[PDB]
Design a protein around this ligand. Structure first.
Ligand SMILES: NC[C@@H]1O[C@H](O[C@H]2[C@@H](O)[C@H](O[C@@H]3[C@@H](O)[C@H](N)C[C@H](N)[C@H]3O[C@H]3O[C@H](CO)[C@@H](O)[C@H](O)[C@H]3N)O[C@@H]2CO)[C@H](N)[C@@H](O)[C@@H]1O
Lengths: 116, 98, 19, 41, 136, 91, 86, 72
RNA sequence: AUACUUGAGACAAUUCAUUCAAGUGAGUUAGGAUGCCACGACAAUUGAGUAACCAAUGAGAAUUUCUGAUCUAUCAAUCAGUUGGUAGUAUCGAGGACUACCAAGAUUAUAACGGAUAACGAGGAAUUGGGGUUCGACAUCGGAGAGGGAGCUUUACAGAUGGCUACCACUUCUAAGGAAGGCAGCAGGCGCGUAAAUUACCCACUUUCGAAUUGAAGAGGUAGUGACGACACAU
RNA sequence: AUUACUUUGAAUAAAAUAAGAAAGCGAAUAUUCAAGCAUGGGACAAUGC
RNA sequence: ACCUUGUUCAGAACUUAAAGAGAAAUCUUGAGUUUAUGGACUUCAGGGGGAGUAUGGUCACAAGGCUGAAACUUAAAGGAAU
RNA sequence: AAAUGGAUUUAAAUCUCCUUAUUUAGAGGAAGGAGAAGUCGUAACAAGGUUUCCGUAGGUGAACCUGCGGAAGGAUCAU
């Protein structure tokens, strides 16, 4: 059964960019995940209504591990291609952000996914 | 002899505790000298007036709630007036008129 | 509209009740 | 523990015992901060 | 209440005090005829440092109930939690009559009252009925 | 299980699967104290080859002081209470 | 222990006594009196003075004093925070 | 997909009591004369589990008081 | 006699019943008053010493709240003082700690109950890119023990064992009637094993005990053996 | 409404670890997690209303 | 209605692949979207033998089924392709 | 205030049945494993000369053989 909309959404995007893409269920996390992926420029029905050569791979992380601020270094070192390219996506007490402002907003929290 | 520690009782689940030491003096119990007056050297050097038996008693203005068998031991709350002191500890019987 | 008490004070419960 | 006085090792033998590119380069006998730099970078 | 071999009496006989940090004495405590030597509000037993909560698991015991606590235990290696529970026996004064199994109760730590009982019910909140209205 | 609250199974799953480990199990079950002739000790004071190799291996049988079991022991060199200490391969 | 302890170990001695770790096996035991074992000696550790926690050795003036009926009460000083006893 | 069968149908309306209707349970408990019909017996269990799943659901929704227990 | 008492220069705290009642988050609370009982002084001291009580030392001792331990289902049901209630007893003191009456209760698949350890726990150690795996008797903290149990004495503190008593198991002296002892303190001997040092000197460091600046200390320091290991360093 | 989560503090034996020839002796020396206390936040969550 | 065509579902399949995956055979409605490693859950495996054997437990009238080791032994056993 | 008698408490030590670990045991045995050249056969690998294998049942010096039902890992992707 459909457990995570975010997991289904990002896999739909990757397979299309590997090959515009459509996401049938839209949530409060799916869209505002994209606003992070759009401010990095990577991306250009009454029932939870329903790409520019830059996205390499966007994926979610299974259970959203609480991330301390000190723990940021371990996650980036694992899930990011380099120290200058990718971006995590964090859900924190002040909205869904990435490793840049969440390091600057001085907060931690759970981790959604990433995109190279 | 008589100890008062919970190292020999069971657990709330019914488990049997296992011995890890021997009886320690801080759990001392004493033989109950029923008051049908001695002194006992308790810990820290204080004295306990152990009234073995006694008949007179100060009072201020036939039945034992705990054990009917006691009916002529003298204990607190016993009816004779109702005793209010601890004769086995204080060494005297102080009671009040019902 | 309180910080996010029963469901009789929540926004779409009271703002509909207000409506 | 065994002793209050501290002690340390002042060397470390190589992992690979025999390698020609090391025998020549090293040739009385054959008897830290880089990572410290690393952690702040 | 005088259904036992001794004339039950209060502790400060001449009585109702109040518990400390932000609590309210229940109504049934004052007007209630019950004589309880271990009642927090109508006796000489106080509530010291610790203060816990939980749901009530059993209401069969005389003047005593069982509180169930559920929590989590983070495990380092797997970076995940596991559900765990602990049950503690809490003395409950007759000042609470509507209290039944499945309700949520704020408790406080008092002196050793029995082999297992060391806490006292302070404030209770009832929940939905678990098909069995089992009270103290 | 992968969810955030499923730490009980994977901890339990790993404990079960460790027993499949031949090397790990040998060091925990009770055979190093009853089946090992050396026990857990290093040395032990006491009192024809395979198909493609021909000859004779000179050997010795030894009864151990402590256990009393009899074991076969090799002699070290050419033309060569006894202290016996294993071989290259452990056990 | 059968009774109250009398000897004191060098390592177990309080930190601020500045005793070395190799001078001798034992350290002088403070006798009972007006000051405790760990609050006496037989910022390197109204206007007030900090004698307790991390702020020990600091002088300054209080701004406000939160109180929590549960456990303790907190004093804020010109700013650093610490309990009343400090 | 379907709860018990592996079929995956998508017949739906498209917008621009049920527990009662499952006691089907009585209409087959038919098993009296046909005692050898093992197909009916296997399908009787499936329908019963539908009831208990619905029974458990309605109780927690307070639709049914929690004394409900369907029998034969 | 500053051992033991009586005895006076004149109170202090215990029990009990009633009452007035301000800190603390919180007290019929510290405290005051009434009547009773109990106990009853500041050595009949010496060239500093002493009794009773209050406070501190005391975050200490002791009990206790919460969370946290290795393997095991070829351990799945377990508990009857068991779980709670009343009233007493006993305790330095809470409490089934115990006794009499009353009730049927407590735990368990979120692993109870039971079994194994070549298990004293922690601070820590070895090794690690991150993550982890293995060890921790052994410097320091806490626990427990003195051949095995058990029962006690003295005191402020002991269920003390370089104190006693009895049994079990041993050791030793004996004039043959009797008699003592507890190295898991320091050395040292045997036995065991692959596996581990001198039957040394001294209170001079650190510290402790004492009627006290002195005395004593196999604590402690010094010296001896010592390819366990570590650092520098001949040929 | 609690809880979880998260940010800051309080409080936190030494030795040791790292740190301001092996050594030795005042580092702000920082720990040291699992809990527990206080606090700013409520996006993702769980518990009834 | 039966046959001929289009459209959109459900079902059993089949054909091609210069792509994706794999050790390859092959797979493609997955055995793809996996070191660029995390959608949810259950079960099983840890070189080859000894061995599904012993012991113990339990189910069956029985044959047997389910659960299930260790001692000891050995440098290979095995897979797909030339 | 000592010997001593008596009744409680705490109870060592010992006896009787029962609960875990470690050991001695012969007829009576019954398995497995290891060691160049010892016997009897042809079972398997080609259609291995009766295709092979699985479950089950029976027989048989031994590989195994035969019956019922499956599988291709078949020697047929095919009328
Ligand atoms: N491995 C145990 C069993 O042994 C059985 O048989 C065993 C023996 O009966 C068999 O014996 C073979 C024999 O088949 C062959 N025709 C002649 C050969 N000399 C024998 O050999 C065997 O015995 C001799 C006796 O001297 C030993 O030297 C030699 O090492 C050993 N392999 O060799 C085997 C090993 O001992 C089965 N062959 C085997 O499948 C099974 O696994």
């Amino acid at each position: 059964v459909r457990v995570n909309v975010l997991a289904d959404a990002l896999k739909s995007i990757t397979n299309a960019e590997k090959q515009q893409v459509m996401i049938r269920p839209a949530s409060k996390v799916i869209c505002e995940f994209l606003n992070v992926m759009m401010k990095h420029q990577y991306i250009t029905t009454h029932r939870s209504g329903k790409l520019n050569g830059r996205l390499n791979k966007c994926a979610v992380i299974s259970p959203r591990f609480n991330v301390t601020l000190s723990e940021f270094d371990k996650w980036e070192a694992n899930l990011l291609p380099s120290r200058h390219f990718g971006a995590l996506v964090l859900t924190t007490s002040y909205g869904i952000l990435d490793n840049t402002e969440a390091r600057a907003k001085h907060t931690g929290g759970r981790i959604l996914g990433f995109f190279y | 002899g008589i100890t008062r520690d919970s190292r020999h009782k069971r657990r709330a689940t019914g488990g049997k505790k296992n011995s890890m030491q021997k009886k320690k003096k801080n759990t001392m119990g004493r033989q109950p000298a029923n008051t049908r007056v001695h002194d006992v050297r308790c810990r820290y050097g204080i004295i306990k007036r152990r009234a073995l038996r006694l008949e007179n008693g100060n009072f201020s203005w036939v039945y034992n709630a705990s054990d009917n068998d006691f009916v002529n031991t003298l204990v607190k709350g016993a009816i004779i007036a109702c005793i209010s002191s601890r004769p086995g500890q204080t060494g005297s019987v102080e009671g009040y008129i019902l | 509209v309180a910080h996010t008490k029963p469901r009789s004070r929540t926004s779409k419960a009271v703002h509909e009740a207000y409506l | 523990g065994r002793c209050l006085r501290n002690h340390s090792i002042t060397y470390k033998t190589p992992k690979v015992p025999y390698e020609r590119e090391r025998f020549d380069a090293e040739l009385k006998n054959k008897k830290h901060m880089r990572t410290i730099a690393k952690v702040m970078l | 209440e005088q259904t036992e071999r001794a004339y039950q009496k209060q502790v400060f006989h001449h009585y109702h005090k109040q518990i400390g940090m932000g609590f309210v004495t229940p109504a049934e405590a004052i007007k209630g005829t019950y004589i309880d030597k271990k009642c927090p509000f109508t006796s000489d037993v106080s509530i010291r440092g610790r203060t816990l909560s939980g749901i009530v698991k059993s209401c069969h015991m005389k003047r005593t109930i069982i509180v169930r606590r559920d929590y989590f235990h983070y495990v380092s290696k797997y970076q995940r939690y596991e559900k765990r529970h602990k049950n503690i026996a809490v003395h409950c004064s007759p000042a609470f009559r509507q209290l039944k199994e499945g309700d949520h109760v704020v408790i406080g730590q008092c002196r050793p009252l029995s082999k297992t009982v060391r806490f006292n019910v302070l404030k209770f909140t009832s929940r939905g009925t678990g098909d069995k209205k089992q009270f103290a | 299980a992968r969810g955030l609250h499923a730490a009980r199974k994977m901890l339990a799953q790993r404990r079960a699967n460790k027993w499949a480990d031949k090397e790990w199990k040998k060091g925990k079950l009770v055979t190093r104290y009853k089946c090992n002739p050396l026990g857990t000790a290093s040395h032990a004071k006491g009192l024809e080859t395979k198909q493609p190799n021909s000859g004779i291996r000179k050997c010795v049988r030894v009864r151990l002081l402590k256990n009393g079991k009899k074991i076969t022991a090799f002699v070290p060199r050419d033309g060569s209470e006894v202290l016996i200490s294993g071989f290259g391969r452990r056990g | 222990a059968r009774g109250p302890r009398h000897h004191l170990k060098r390592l177990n001695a309080p930190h601020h006594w500045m005793l070395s770790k190799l001078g001798g096996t034992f350290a002088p035991k403070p006798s009972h009196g007006p000051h405790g074992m760990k609050e006496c000696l037989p910022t390197k550790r109204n206007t007030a003075m900090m004698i307790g926690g991390n702020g020990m050795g600091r002088v300054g003036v209080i701004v406000k004093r939160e109180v929590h009926p549960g456990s303790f009460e907190i004093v804020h000083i010109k700013t650093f925070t610490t309990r009343l006893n400090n | 997909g379907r709860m018990y069968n592996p079929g995956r149908g998508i017949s739906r309306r498209c917008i621009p009591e049920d527990l009662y209707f499952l006691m089907r349970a009585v209409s087959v408990r038919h098993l009296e004369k046909n005692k050898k019909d093992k197909d009916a017996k296997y399908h009787l269990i499936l329908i019963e589990s539908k009831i208990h799943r619905l029974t458990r659901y309605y109780k927690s929704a307070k639709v049914l008081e929690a004394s409900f227990k369907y029998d034969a």
